[PDB]
């Protein structure tokens, strides 16, 4: 079956930047949508950003809009999240998700194991 290899998490202070990377391995076709979700300690999992395999159709969570930028290699099963102006509220495990719809978590079928992002005061 398919593996979503994630990388790029770390520990930074408020105002810093990080870049998350994800590549799906072993899928014979193209995931139309891939995106990023996150789950903070105690909180419900939430969509962060998603986009289509042509390079467009980007969707952002209201709280990250203007600070995070999603991209993909066009036509490929990769997805990337440039995270700037990081806030403590962004601390969470971030998950790549592949083969889904908009930012609706239950509509995504493939999930990475998660990459930890910690933003200090």
């Amino acid at each position: 079956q398919v593996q979503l290899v994630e990388s790029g998490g770390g520990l930074v202070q408020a105002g810093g930047s990080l870049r998350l990377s994800c590549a799906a391995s072993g899928y014979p076709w193209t995931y139309i949508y891939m995106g990023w979700f996150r789950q903070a300690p105690g909180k419900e999992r939430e969509g962060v950003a998603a986009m289509d395999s042509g390079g467009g159709g980007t969707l952002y969570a209201d709280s990250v809009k203007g600070r995070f930028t999603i991209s993909r290699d066009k036509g490929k099963n990769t997805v990337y999240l440039q995270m700037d102006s990081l806030k403590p509220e962004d601390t969470a495990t971030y998950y790549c998700a592949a083969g889904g719809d908009a930012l609706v978590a239950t509509r995504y079928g493939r999930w990475g194991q998660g990459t930890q992002v910690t933003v200090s005061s």
Partner: peptide, 17 residues
Amino acid sequence: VCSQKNVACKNGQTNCY
């Protein structure tokens, strides 16, 4: 089939296979 070729749904959703 949910693990097979991802295609657009008739209603515009992209979680069809």
